[model samples]
Target chain A: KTVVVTTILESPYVMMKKNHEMLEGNERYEGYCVDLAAEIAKHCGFKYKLTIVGDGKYGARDADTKIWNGMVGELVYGKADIAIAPLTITLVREEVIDFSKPFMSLGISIMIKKGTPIESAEDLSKQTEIAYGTLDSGSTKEFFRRSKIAVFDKMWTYMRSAEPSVFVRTTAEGVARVRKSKGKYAYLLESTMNEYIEQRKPCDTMKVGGNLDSKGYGIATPKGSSLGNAVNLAVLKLSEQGLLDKLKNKWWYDKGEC
Target chain B: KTVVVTTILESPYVMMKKNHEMLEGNERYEGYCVDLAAEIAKHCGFKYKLTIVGDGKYGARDADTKIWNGMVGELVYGKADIAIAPLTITLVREEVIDFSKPFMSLGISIMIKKGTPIESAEDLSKQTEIAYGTLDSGSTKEFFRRSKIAVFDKMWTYMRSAEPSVFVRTTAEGVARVRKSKGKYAYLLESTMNEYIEQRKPCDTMKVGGNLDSKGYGIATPKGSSLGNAVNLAVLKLSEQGLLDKLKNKWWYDKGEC
Candidate 1:
C-alpha cells in the first residue's frame, strides 16, 4: 500500500506544477517536501503518494469543541498515514498526535519593509505608526493570544480589534501587505519563510529582530502510528548526511532572484 | 521532601563558586543550569537540592551489561528525583526515561584552531593534516559509531585509532588540545558551549560548519513519574515567557571576557 503523505500547498514546501492542469496525481506538484518525501520513502522502504491538505491550513484545534483540523485532522481521521509537512511540533498538537524529532528549527519572526523603524517586537509593541499582525488561525497568532508576556500580550490586545483588521487569511497576503504598506504594516511569520521571502524577487521586505520564540517542524503521525519510528530515524540520518541543509539551500537560496 | 536534582558540573552550566570551599550544598554551585534550576523550582513550586552526578558523565548504557550510567542512571535507578541538566534527548534514553519538551536545542559541532583549514566535516574526513575526535563515553562518539552516512562513518573509522589517542575524557581537554596544537587539532563538542568558548578571552578557537545533527537537552525523570507533567509544562511556559532566552544571554554572552 502506498503511504499517504499530507502536506500543505505552499510556495517552497509544495506547489502546483506550472502545467498542473495538464498533469495528473503527485506529478502535478513539486517543491522541497516533494523532494524530501521521495527521500523519506526511499529510506523508509515504502511507496508514498503526496496529497495537499484539503483545508489549505496547518493543524489547529477548535477552542470550543477540541476537534482537530487540517493536516492534523487528516491524520486523526485516518485519511492520511503521515504528514510530511511544515507542521510545527507544539504542546497542544503533541497531546493528539506524535511528532518526530524536529527536522528543521524555526520561530515566529518579524517581516518588515526594509529600513522600517522596528528592530524588535518590543519596538513594534510600543509604536502606533506600524500596525503589525499575524496570519489568522495560525501558530503565530495563537502565540500572541496565549502569551502572558507583557509585550506580546499588549500586541495581541491591539491586533484583535484594530480598525483595519490586521489579520490576514494567507501568508502570501501578509507578505504582500508588508510590501505595499510602504512601512505602516509589519508581518509576523516563521523565520524560514521570512528568510525565503527575503531572497525572492522584489526583495523589498526583510526579517528583523530575534525570533519571538523557538520551536521546530516535525514529521507528524497519528497517535502510535507504526511509521513514526522509521520516519523519525530517517530524518535524523538525513540531517546528519547534510542533505537537509542542502535541500534548504536548494529551495530557499539557490534560486534567489534578489 | 526536597527534589533531588541530578546535574553535572560543567562550565557555563554548573561550576563551583570562587569561594566554593566556604560555601556548602546547593549554594556552592552556579551557572546556567543553576539559574534554570532555581526558576524551575520557583515555577513548579517545589524546593530542590542540586547534586552533581556522582559519575561526572552525561549518560550511556553498557553494551555488555545493558546497564544505564550517569545522570540517566541516577533517575533510572531511583537515586535522584529528577535530572535538570544538559542531558541530550535521544531514542535510547527515551526508552527508559521520560523527557520534557526540549528546554534548549543543540547539536554536535566542529571546533577548530583559529587558523585551521577545515570548514566542514567532509573536509576533515577527506584530509589527515588536521586531526579531530570527540569526547569518549558521550553521545557524540556514539553518533559516529551508529551513523550509516559515508563521511561520518569514515570520520569514526579514523578517530577510533588516531595516533596519540585523539579521544579525551572531558570537553575542556578537547578544547585545550586544540589551543595547544596550533591548528593541528580540531574538536567536536556541543555548540552551546562551543559558542560560549568562542566568546571567552584569548579566543583563538572557533566553531566551523553547521551542526552535524539537530537535537535538544531536556529535563528527564523516571518513566511515568508524576512530576514529569508539571515540570515539563514549567519549561514550556518559561520558554514562552522568554525567561530561557534571558538566561541564555546572561550566562553565555553577557559576562564574556572577550
Candidate 2:
C-alpha cells in the first residue's frame, strides 16, 4: 500500500526539476517541502506517491457551493491520503482535516520595492502615497476583511476601495508589482513567500516590517485519519532534532542568488 | 445557560485576587488568563462561570487507567464546557479536545540561579556538575522521555536516574530548588512562567538559552463542541486586536515587583 501525497508547484516549496523527460517519479520535483515529504516518509516508514494538486491553489472554500478546493479539497474529497506543502493552517480548514504541529512559522507581512520607507503595518495604515494589496480570495484576504484589529481593518478599506483594483491574481503578480512599482506599491504576503522572493535574483524587493500576524504551515491529513498520529510524531521528531530548521535553510537561503 | 469554565491557579496566568474572600464568581480571580477568559466570553457573548480545576493540574492522562485529570479532564468528562487557562496545546490533548490557535507562544526553556554559567540546552546536555529537571508528568517531561533527539535523549537518561531525585512536584518547587541550589540546579520551564518569574521580586533566577522547542497555550473545548468555532474566532480577534498582548503584559510585566 502507498500513501498518495498531494502538493502544489509553489516555488521554494515545490518546483519542477530542471531536466528533460528522463527524470520520473519523486525525482521530477525538488524544493523545501519536497525534502520534507521524503523525511516524513522515511520516519513513518511509508512508501508513497506524490502528485501535484489538480487545482493550483493553497486551498479555499466556495461560499455558495460549500465545496473545498486545492490540497485541502484533495483530502476532504479523498483524492489523496495526505498533503505535504506550504499549506497554512487555518481554522476553517481544521474543521475538516487534521494538521501536524507547524513545520514552519509565517504570517502576513509586507513586500516592498527597494527604497520604500514603510516600517510596519502602522506605516501602511497611515500612508496614502503607496498602495498595497493581497492575493485575491484567501486567508490573508479574508484576514483583513474580517479583522477587528484597527490597522488591518483600515488597510482593508483602502484595498477594497482602491481605483486600480489593488487585488492580485497570484503571488507572482503581487511580487512583480512590488518589484516594479518603484515604491508606489507594497504587497501583503505570507512572510515565507516574501522572504524567499527577497532572496531570489535581482533582490529588488525588500521584506520590511515585522509580520502583521503570525501562524504556521503544517502537513495535513483527512479528519480522523489514522496517519495523523504517525505523521505528527515525524514532525515533532524532526523538529526537536533540528532537522526542520536545517531543511528550511537548505532550500530558502542556500538557493538564494543575491 | 452559564458556560462552566475550568481553569487552574497558576500564577500570572490564573490566581486568586487579594480580596478573594469578598469577591464572587469570576471576579475572585485575576491574572493573564483570567483577563483572556473575560475577553473571549465577551466576544462570544456568553455568560460564564469560572471554577478552579478539582485536581489542580494542567491535565495529563494516566498511563494505566487511561483516565484524564485537571481542566482537560473536566471538559472530557462533561464537567465543564470549556477551559481557559495556561494549559498547553499538546498532541495528546489535541487527540481528545479542540484548541484555539495559540493565544500565546511558549517553549521549554531553562532557568538557573542568577550566577549560573549555563547558556543553552547544548550547555546542559554536555555538563554534569549542575543538576536539572522538569516538573513531573507533563509535556516537557514527556518531551525528553520519548525524545529520539540525541541531546534530549541523553539528558532524559540522566534525569531519570539522577541522585536526590531532580524531579519536582510542581513548578514552584522547581523554581525554589533552582534558587536554593545556588548555581547547582537548573529548572526547565515553559518560557511564559520563566518570563513571569524573572520579573517578580527575589529575582534570583534567570532564564537562559533560546527555547528548546516552540508551541503555544490555547483555550480548549471537548471534541465536537459547538462552542469550539466561536471561541476560536474570539481568540484570533483578541490576539489580532492586541488585547492578548496587553493582558499578558498587564499580569506578567505590569505587576512585576523586581
Candidate 3:
C-alpha cells in the first residue's frame, strides 16, 4: 500500500519551490520537511504521496466534541499513513497517536522585535506596556493553557483574558505583527521557526530569554500502525549519522540571507 | 532553636564583601542571598545564624557511600537547620529533604568568550576546536551526566573522556578558565551567574544560546523540619511583594562594572 503522507504548508518546512508551476508531483516542493520526508521514505522503503493537512491547524482536541482537529485528526481518522511535519509531540496527542522519536527538538520561545526591553516572559508578564501571545491552536498556545508554573499560569491568565485578544492564526501573521508593532507585540512560537526567521531577510525579531518549556516534534503515525517502530528507529539512525543536523544547517542557515 | 542556615560562599550569591574583615557575624557577607535571608527570617519570625558549608560544594551524593555533600548534605544529615543559597532543586535531593518554593530561577547556560563561532551546545558538540565543561558536582554537570537526549548524552560522553580534564571545582574557577583559555574553552553554569559575570569588568564573555534545562533554586530544610512550612510561605510572600526582584537587581545589575 502506498503511504499517504500528511504535512502542513509551513515556510522552510514544506513550501512550493520557486519553479513550482513547471514542476510535477513532489518535485514542486522544497523545504526542511520536504527533504526529511524523502529521506525517511528512502530509509523505510515506502512509496508515499505528500498532502497538506486540510485545516492548516497544528492539532488540538476539541473541548465539547471530544474530537481531534488538524493533522492529528487526519491521522486519527486513518486518512493519512504518516504525518511528516513540524507537529509537536504533546502528552494529550500521544494518547491517540504514536510519535517517532522526535525528528526535531524545539520549545516555546519568545520572539521579540529587536531593541525591545522585554528580556524574558517574566519581563513581559510583569508589565502592560509590551503585549505577547502564542500562535492560535498550536502546541505553544496549548502549553500556556496546561501550564502549572506560577509565572506561566499568570501569563496564560493574562493572555486568555486580555482585552485585545493576543493569539494569532499563523506564524507568518505573528511575525508580521511583531515587525509592524514597533516593539509593542511579541509572538511566541517554536524556537526552530523563530530562529529561522531571525536569519532571514528584514530580520527584526530575536528569540529572547530561554524557551518557556522543553519538548520536541516527531513524525507521527496512527496508533498501532506497523510503521511506528520503523519510523522511530529511522529518526534515531538519521540523528546518529548527523544527517539531521546537516539538514538543519542546509535549510536554516546555509540559505540564511541575514 | 536558632536556625542554622547552611550556604556556600559563591560570588554574588553569598560572598565576603571587601570590608568583610572589618565586620562580624552575618554582616561580613553581602549578596543576593544575604539580603534574601534577612527578609525571609524577618517574615518567619526566626533568629538565624549563617554558616558556610564546610566542603565548599553545592551538594552531590557519592555513588558508593550514598552520602550527600555541600548544602544539600548539610540539610539531609541535619548538620544545618536550613539552606539558603543557590541550591538547585533536583528530584533526588527533593526525596531526602524539603524545599521551599524557589527563591530564584536559573538554568544551565553556555558561557563563551567573545568572537567565538559557537552559538549553542549543538555548535560546540559538532566541533573539536573549543573545549567546554561545567562546574563539577553541580546541577549543570549532573544534567549532562543524566541526560537522555542524544545531543546532551553525546556531549557528556565526550566531556567525560576529554583530555586534561574539563570539570572545574567552583563557578569562579570555571569563569577564570574561560577568561584564560583564549577562546579555546566555554564554561557551562547557571544562567543567573553567567549574566552576572557578563556585566562585570573585562566583559568579553557572553551567554550564548538558550538554556539546556529549566529549574530553580529553592530554600531547603531538613526532612520533616518544622521550619519548612514557614520558610516556604515566607518565600511566597516575599516573591509576591516583589522583594526577590529587588534583591536580584541590587546584587546583579546595580553594581554593574561594565
Best by TM-score: 1
Q: Give the candidate number with the greatest DockQ.
A: 1
- Please give, for residues B63-156, the per-residue lDDT of candidate 1 as tens digits: 8987888888889999888888878776667667767667777788888989899899899999999999987666777777777778889999
- Calculate candidate 2's fnat: 0.22
Q: TM-scores across all candidates?
A: 0.86, 0.83, 0.56
Better of 2 and 3 by TM-score: 2
Q: Proportion of native contacts in model 3?
A: 0.00
Please identify which of the two predictions, 2 or 3, would achieve the higher DockQ against the true structure.
2
* Candidate 2, B180-249: lDDT as tens digits: 8998899888888888898887999878998777777879899768887788768767766767767877
Q: How does chain B score by TM in each prediction?
A: 0.95, 0.96, 0.97
lDDT of 1 by residue, A1-258 (tens): 899999988778788889999988778888777777888889899899899889877778878988788888888889889898878777666667777767777788999999899998999999989999988767788788888889999999988877698888777988999999997899988887888889998999999998898877778888679897678767766765656767787889998878
List where candidate 3 sits over 4 angstroms from the true fold: A1-258
lDDT by residue (A1-258, candidate 2, tens digit) is 799998877778888888816788888888888888999999989887878888766677877987888888899999988889888777677768767767777789999988998988889999988999987655677668767788989999988887697778667888999988889889998898899999997799978998887767778899879787678768766765667777888988988887
